[PDB]
Amino acid sequence: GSHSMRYFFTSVSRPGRGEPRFIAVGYVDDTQFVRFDSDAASQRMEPRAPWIEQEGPEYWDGETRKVKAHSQTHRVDLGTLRGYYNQSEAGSHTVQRMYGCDVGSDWRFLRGYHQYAYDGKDYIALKEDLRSWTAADMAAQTTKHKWEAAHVAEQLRAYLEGTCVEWLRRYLENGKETLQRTDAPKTHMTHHAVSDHEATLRCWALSFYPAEITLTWQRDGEDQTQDTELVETRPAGDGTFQKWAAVVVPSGQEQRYTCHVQHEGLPKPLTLRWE
């Protein structure tokens, strides 16, 4: 199938409490594999998946050198943006940056992305064509113009089409047993009485990978979107994911209701019924 590698960076100013916090994480599909935290003791990029622990000191030194350079540009960025928005020196602000690339099921370059936010809203993004920029504010046009003059999109495109996907494929190979796995959901239902005339039917999907899943209820084969409580897919902590979907079923109607599960790990979708 399709795959992705994505790096997520957060910088948060702390006026009067020293340097800004900087946190970097890297993911392949839904699996975290590296972190850096400026507040941690080591001051190194660090492994978070077992398959990347096999990369030698050259890798770790170079990723540490680069992540610290990212930390320093974001430090300057916080000051620059505060000047752009005429903000005071007292308040805490947030920059977020995300970039990375997708390959399709032929493993070739599909999509490349790079975006940047200030205080939780879009600031600038690379367009789909990887040649131009979308600037939100009037402040972001200064950045757009800076970046156009320094030909950043050219340099970025080269990374996204070249380095980014080459290393993605390397990681997919090296971590084959983790990243090219699917864990099918293990499914069950629970039934709990609201009162005498209705009961909650909850359809569970546990221990699945990757995170993408469709969990729906139907009544007489008609979908119940409007009447289903659906929770956000949530991490189990062990690299798998959990989700549930519940509906309120009037007395005697359990047989009308079917829960439907779609996941890449399943040989065919499941149709579950309380019976």
Partner: peptide, 9 residues
Amino acid sequence: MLWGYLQYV
């Protein structure tokens, strides 16, 4: 692998 060629806003 990270991009090595960052730029200021």
